Amino acid sequence: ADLLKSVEFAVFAGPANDPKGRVAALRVPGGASLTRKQIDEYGNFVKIYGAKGLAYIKVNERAKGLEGINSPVAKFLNAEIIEDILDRTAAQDGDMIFFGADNKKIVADAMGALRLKVGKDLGLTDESKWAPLWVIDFPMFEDDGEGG
Amino acid sequence: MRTEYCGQLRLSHVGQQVTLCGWVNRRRDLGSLIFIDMRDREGIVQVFFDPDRADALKLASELRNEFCIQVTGTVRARDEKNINRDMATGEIEVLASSLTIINRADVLPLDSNHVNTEEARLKYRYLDLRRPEMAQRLKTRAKITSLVRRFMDDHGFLDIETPMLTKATPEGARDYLVPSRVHKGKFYALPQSPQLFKQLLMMSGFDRYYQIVKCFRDEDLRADRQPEFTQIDVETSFMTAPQVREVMEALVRHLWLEVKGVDLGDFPVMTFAEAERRYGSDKPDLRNPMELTDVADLLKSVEFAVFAGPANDPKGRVAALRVPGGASLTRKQIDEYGNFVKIYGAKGLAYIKVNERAKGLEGINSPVAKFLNAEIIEDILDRTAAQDGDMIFFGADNKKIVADAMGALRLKVGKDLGLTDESKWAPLWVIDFPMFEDDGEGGLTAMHHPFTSPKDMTAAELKAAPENAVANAYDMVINGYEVGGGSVRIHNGDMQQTVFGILGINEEEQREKFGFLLDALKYGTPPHAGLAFGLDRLTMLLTGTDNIRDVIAFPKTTAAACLMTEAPSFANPTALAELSIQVVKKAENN
Amino acid sequence: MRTEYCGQLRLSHVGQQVTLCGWVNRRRDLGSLIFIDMRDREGIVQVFFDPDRADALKLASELRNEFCIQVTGTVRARDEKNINRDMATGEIEVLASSLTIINRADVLPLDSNHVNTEEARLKYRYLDLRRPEMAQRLKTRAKITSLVRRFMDDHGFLDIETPMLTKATPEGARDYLVPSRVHKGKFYALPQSPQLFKQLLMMSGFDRYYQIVKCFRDEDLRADRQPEFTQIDVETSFMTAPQVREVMEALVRHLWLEVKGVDLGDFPVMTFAEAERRYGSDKPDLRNPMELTDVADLLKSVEFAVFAGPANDPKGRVAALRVPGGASLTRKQIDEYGNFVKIYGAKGLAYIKVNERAKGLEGINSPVAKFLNAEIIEDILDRTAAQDGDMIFFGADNKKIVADAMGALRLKVGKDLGLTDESKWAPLWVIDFPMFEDDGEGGLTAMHHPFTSPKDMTAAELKAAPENAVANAYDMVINGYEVGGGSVRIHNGDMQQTVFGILGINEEEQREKFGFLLDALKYGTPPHAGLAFGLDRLTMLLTGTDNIRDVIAFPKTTAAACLMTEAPSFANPTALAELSIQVVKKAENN
Ligand SMILES: [Mg+2]
Ligand SMILES: [Mg+2]
């Protein structure tokens, strides 16, 4: 988000400047080879969780520039912003960066399941492994929907 | 100067010398003999350069992809073994006697035998529109608008232009603003449609109006949703809904005959209420033979809450989906669907496998048969008319949950089991759409524009029980897509006032949202009604595409940007200066 | 539900029972008899209510003008003594048998038995459109577009839509900006025309395009100048200019034959130079037989500063206007003219009365005879082929002021002396326009537009002497009005780049402003020419009207306002914040 608070592109800008939102990037290893068909399916899969789409950036020849990538949103971004993303997400040649731009809950829900799907669909998820962990500091309360 | 178009050559042209202007679509060589697929707007024709002299040839060996050339030669039959079935001109070829290279062509940035992002094609749109597959969709759109015009003009509709620069703060505040250089600080609005002007033209006595016109939306550019879209706009006077539907139906039928050669046949008509019940959609796909059956009343007394509750709830339903030949279905498959319906709010998906009715409870196989009984399952198999082999799926929830879930489940199953003949044309009319609904905080809001009239209510009965009042509105669906809609407007002022009252639109509001109109209704307003067909949809259906961008010559992307011209763009400060506006940004604490 | 239109009924209908729908135009009681002149878009029909049918006559006594009614009656022959030869339905009337008052009507705020101000009419536009004179204009406009469309279709032009949400481009003129809610800080531009998009379509393979589309000029609005106007946009491929004019000259003749029923003949053809040398404008009115003559060459050595000066000025000319029977003019008369030309920035208006060339200088009277001499005056008369009883005015100044003022005085003197036959049609083609025109700021501007091809000058020669380059451009003038025009486009990249150069736009700007255009020219661009027509002017000319606002359903005033809707207006403050913009003071910020 902090990388895109400026951009004129409201699709990113709105939610990046909106504290109840966020622009989330999901880096999928060697997912650049993903297909026109496959991207579109995911596009619709995220909708199930409230997402109004899925912007992407296909990373080909990293150290080559905006020339080294390939993205429908690249023109709404620029050279500097895109290196920051490829860097931050530690993208690699042949990698795929997916974007979720909406209110925190939707981005969490969409990119969270999307993150899971892509893992199984691409077998990046080694399910033979055991991954335990602690999640601490839960909110005290939840919205009750009726005000309380 | 051509004498004919490449793609129109046929066996009947043999012996005729022709002159063709076009482009090289593909080039192939047989030794020194050069074969070229010469293309122009009508399609491709094979042209062969076979001079028995090295002089004449020269030029031809230079031709490459997209060269713009002129050649004059004679038509002849292709040798039986080379006749091309998939080519309108495939039974003939042209033997060139003259060649003129009008203009070369650099190497194309768009790949021919490779895959191109819709991003590149959009950037090189003028290159992509050359593809015969692409040209054709736009050639057909031209025949479609030509057919509409001639049909409308013949049935007495007047083509009368309405303004694009219009009164701002018009509808939903979902429009484009155009700042005025002359009236500093003031704006016009690009129209959602000739919304109020066509009604004015009915007051002005024109009797029937239509226009092929552009419209603008300004929401979040969903895919299939451009920032501007063309509508076949219609308005009539002294006509009832049925009489409006009939003429608009003869239009579509006329379009299918003349374009696809199919006779759509009389359109079925349904009520918004019947549609949600039967198909769980206000836009039913009737290419799918299945349908939902209500069986709530058959289950109002069982002990099983899953059914008993939704069955007894006044705002709940228990829909039965009978899928012919579905008993032969996998736990795996029955589990996918089990999940699939979860996407729309379903908690589950009970089912009854029907193997052999004649044998009774022992004829079925079902996890819930236990909680039911012989009679109930018999009544249900009767209502749904289950044949041995059929599967009965049940969605038992809130009217909405069931509708979207089973609605969706019906569509998926049908495709899956090959039950829906994707190749059938299923047109219909959905009518009697509710009049109102809850808006944001409730109260009540118009399902259509506020000038729509009630179908079967009095101003008082309406003021008395508006919640479920039924509108005199109609929709044309073709294979599950809203392709048109309209309604009968109000001509009785008492009635218009009551609507506004129900709507919460007070006097000051009325006066600024549409005062000239309201004024216009004071001079003997005739009964009037209209409708609008989305031209883009119409064209998608008529050319078998599914991508809205394929029926528009210069479409924008989802982000409403144009990749070729690169609009929208930063404006010149000079210009912003005369316009008396300036770009600003929240100076949030800095 | 009507059965017929009030105005179509003729004797041929005598006998039938008809159901009319429409408005009460007039009402006349004749004893206990009630007569109504019922109206609908086809016209007026007299309706007779007999006391024999008690209830219809009962309701009919409440009918006032403009009531919306329905009457079912019987058509019948009026008596010979009651035939009204001035109504199309003047030989019949309808003996009513039933009446239904659909809606009463308030007294119209727009009086009809009297004349109104174009202003009051525009506020109640809807009402003013109920008038026959008015409604006939729109119906002929519908007829014309319909005759155009069938024409284009028969000749193979495809109707392809272009976008209205465009990219603000360099030069040309001024656009209406449209801020973007998705690309905050960026705009689109309403198109001045499908100018670059139609060429892009000729490069896409479509071969002939046309569209009846809206264009927006945000420059100050003149007399018959609306902010929006409609053009019959045309673009062709593989055709020369003479060929383009041919078919284009055919569409217009067809219009004049189908509409006013006149034949025009082959349009004469004049070059820009001839047109200026002879009439002082690039849109001459050949209805006026007079024509200007040049004499500067004869006045270089005169003492008289009023001639000598502009005659030795490279950018000046001294034009003589021989006005037949002009000697008869009076002093008050000669002075109005003298002042008249002042309006166009000219000085005075020297003159010579030729009473008898049979007396040399003695046969002529003049305030400037003493300045010229026996020789110079003989050449001036010969050159002008002056007749005894002829007046010769002289305009000496800057080429543009002379053309401007002398071509104006040429037209005015035409009406005054009754020398122009307002009844004739004078159509023609003005061709061979220059590529550029001095822009008053140091450089050059495209006479027609940046993409116009030069008749025969090479890129090099064009770099050498651009001011002198002749264009492959043509205008169609009819009676002194520019109805349409266009040019053969540039299909070569170096050429296009070169012109962008002369136009003062640099590589970088060319790249970012016309980059898509510069690339497309690399892929076999075919030769292509086009032309646009002024629909509104065409309709004006064909409906014999001089008020362009009389051919538009809902036009705006000269200040670009809509008195009926009240736009432009203030936009919702919120709307602007969502658009990331705000209105400012002309001074204030910067
Ligand atoms: Mg709808
Ligand atoms: Mg002009």
Contacts of C181 in chain A (CB under 8 A): 10
Which two three-digit tokens encode residue A146? 């009726």
* Residues paired with residue C270 on neighbouring β-strands, in sequence order: C430
Tokens 């026109």 sit on residue: A36
CB contact under 8 A, C183 and A8: yes
C391: which residues sit within 8 A by CB, 6+ positions away? C322, C323, C325, C326, C327, C328, C329, C351, C352, C353, C354
Distance B482 CA to ligand 1 centre (A): 6
> With contact defined as beta carbons under 8 Å apart, do C26 and C36 qualify?
yes
> With contact defined as beta carbons under 8 Å apart, do B148 and C546 qualify?
no
Which two three-digit tokens encode residue B247? 């003429």
CA distances from B36 to A34, B96, C557 (A): 36, 10, 58
Nearest alpha carbon to residue B549 among B568, B531, B562: B562
CA separation for the pair B147, A141 (Å, rounded): 63
Q: Angle at the Cα of C365 (from C362 to C367), degrees rounded to 5?
A: 130
Residues of B with CB under 8 A from a CB of A: 115, 117-119, 220, 222, 343, 557-559, 561, 563, 566, 586
Nearest Cβ partner of B559 from A48, A70, A76?
Answer: A76
Nearest alpha carbon to residue A9 among B223, B547, B558: B558
Q: Give the method of determination.
A: X-ray
What's the resolution in A? 2.7
**CATH 3.30.1360.30 domain extents, chain B:** 271-420
Distance C482 CA to ligand 2 centre (A): 7
Tokens 């008050």 sit on residue: C332
CA distances from B359 to B44, B320, B374, B389 (A): 64, 21, 11, 13
Residue B535, annotated as binding a ligand: yes
Question: Helices marked H in B29-180 — which ranges?
Answer: 54-57, 118-123, 125-128, 132-154
> With contact defined as beta carbons under 8 Å apart, do B479 and B425 qualify?
yes
> With contact defined as beta carbons under 8 Å apart, do C68 and C103 qualify?
yes
CA separation for the pair B327, B392 (Å, rounded): 8
Residues of A with CB under 8 A from a CB of B: 9, 11, 17, 36, 48, 52-53, 70, 72-73, 75-76
Nearest Cβ partner of B581 from C565, C570, C583?
Answer: C583
How far C163 CA lies from chain A's nearest CA (Å)?
21
> With contact defined as beta carbons under 8 Å apart, do B502 and B447 qualify?
no
Residues of A with CB under 8 A from a CB of C: 8-11, 13, 76
CA separation for the pair C351, C338 (Å, rounded): 10
By three-state DSSP, how is residue B470 classified?
strand
How far C179 CA lies from chain A's nearest CA (Å)?
12
Q: Angle at the Cα of C420 (from C419 to C425), degrees rounded to 5?
A: 150
**Residue A17: CA count within 13 A, CB half-sphere:** 14
DSSP label at residue A68: T
> With contact defined as beta carbons under 8 Å apart, do B521 and C105 qualify?
no
Backbone angles phi and psi of C74, in degrees to 5: -120, 135
Question: Helices marked H in C344-438 — which ranges?
Answer: 374-384, 399-416
CB contact under 8 A, A36 and B117: yes
DSSP element (H, E) containing C340: helix C331-343
Tokens 């070059």 sit on residue: C271
**Start-to-end Cα distance in chain A:** 30
Tokens 């552009």 sit on residue: B214
Instruction: Please state the separation of Cα B438 from the chain's center in Å.
Output: 27
CATH topology of domain B1-106: OB fold (Dihydrolipoamide Acetyltransferase, E2P) (2.40.50)
| Gyration radius of chain A over CA positions | 16
* Domain covering A1-125 assigned CATH 3.30.1330.60 in the classification: no
* Residues paired with residue B325 on neighbouring β-strands, in sequence order: none
Count of CB atoms situated within 10 Å of the CB of B119: 15
> With contact defined as beta carbons under 8 Å apart, do C488 and C445 qualify?
no
Ligand nearest to the CA of residue B474, numbered in listed order: 1
Instruction: Please state the separation of Cα C342 from the chain's center in Å.
Output: 26
> With contact defined as beta carbons under 8 Å apart, do B280 and B292 qualify?
yes
CA separation for the pair A1, A13 (Å, rounded): 8
CA distances from B335 to B306, B311, C332 (A): 18, 24, 103
CA distances from C4 to C12, C96, C111 (A): 13, 14, 29
DSSP label at residue C565: T
Nearest alpha carbon to residue C481 among C286, C278, C227: C286
Nearest alpha carbon to residue C238 among C530, C532, C531, C528: C528
Q: Angle at the Cα of B257 (from B256 to B261), degrees rounded to 5?
A: 95
Nearest alpha carbon to residue B6 among B16, B23, B25, B20: B20
Nearest Cβ partner of C153 from B70, B146, B520?
Answer: B146
Q: What is the dihedral of CA C105, C111, C116, C118, to 10 degrees?
A: 0
> With contact defined as beta carbons under 8 Å apart, do C65 and C105 qualify?
yes
Contacts of C490 in chain B (CB under 8 A): none
* Residues paired with residue C479 on neighbouring β-strands, in sequence order: none
Nearest alpha carbon to residue C130 among B164, B243, B526: B526
Backbone angles phi and psi of B219, in degrees to 5: -95, -150
B403: which residues sit within 8 A by CB, 6+ positions away? B276, B280, B281, B317
CA separation for the pair C163, B13 (Å, rounded): 39
Contacting chains of C (3 CB pairs or more, <8 Å) are: A, B
> With contact defined as beta carbons under 8 Å apart, do B290 and B263 qualify?
no
CB-count exposure of residue C391 (10 Å: 0-12, 13-18, 19+): buried
> With contact defined as beta carbons under 8 Å apart, do B425 and B264 qualify?
yes
Concatenating the DSSP letter of every residue in B308-346 gives: HHHHHSTTEEEEEEEETT-SS--HHHHHHHHHHGGGGT-
Distance B317 CA to ligand 1 centre (A): 24
- Tell me the CATH number of domain B109-270+421-587, given options 3.20.20.300, 3.30.930.10, 3.30.360.10, 3.40.50.2300: 3.30.930.10
B111: which residues sit within 8 A by CB, 6+ positions away? none
CATH topology of domain C109-270+421-585: BirA Bifunctional Protein; domain 2 (3.30.930)
Measured in residues, chain B has a length of 590
The conformational region for residue B54 under phi > 0 = left, psi -120 to 50 = alpha, else beta, is: alpha
CA separation for the pair A5, A16 (Å, rounded): 5
B441: which residues sit within 8 A by CB, 6+ positions away? none
CA separation for the pair C461, C450 (Å, rounded): 17
| One-letter identity of residue B42 | E
CA separation for the pair C474, C483 (Å, rounded): 11
* Residues paired with residue C477 on neighbouring β-strands, in sequence order: C428, C482
Which two three-digit tokens encode residue C207? 């071969």
Nearest alpha carbon to residue C229 among B161, B72, B579, B549: B161
CA separation for the pair B6, B19 (Å, rounded): 9
Which two three-digit tokens encode residue C549? 């606002």
**CATH 3.30.930.10 domain extents, chain B:** 109-270+421-587
Contacts of A10 in chain C (CB under 8 A): 181-184
> With contact defined as beta carbons under 8 Å apart, do B74 and B95 qualify?
yes
Concatenating the DSSP letter of every residue in B399-445 gives: HHHHHHHHHHHHHHHHHHTT-S-TTS--EEEEE--BS---BTTBS--
CA separation for the pair C48, C76 (Å, rounded): 10
By three-state DSSP, how is residue B455 classified?
coil
By three-state DSSP, how is residue B194 classified?
coil
- Give the CATH architecture of domain C271-420: 2-Layer Sandwich (3.30)
CA distances from B311 to B302, B303, B307, B347 (A): 10, 11, 6, 15
Nearest alpha carbon to residue A55 among A108, A9, A124, A20: A9
Q: Angle at the Cα of B522 (from B521 to B528), degrees rounded to 5?
A: 30
CA separation for the pair B76, B73 (Å, rounded): 10
**CATH 2.40.50.140 domain extents, chain C:** 1-106
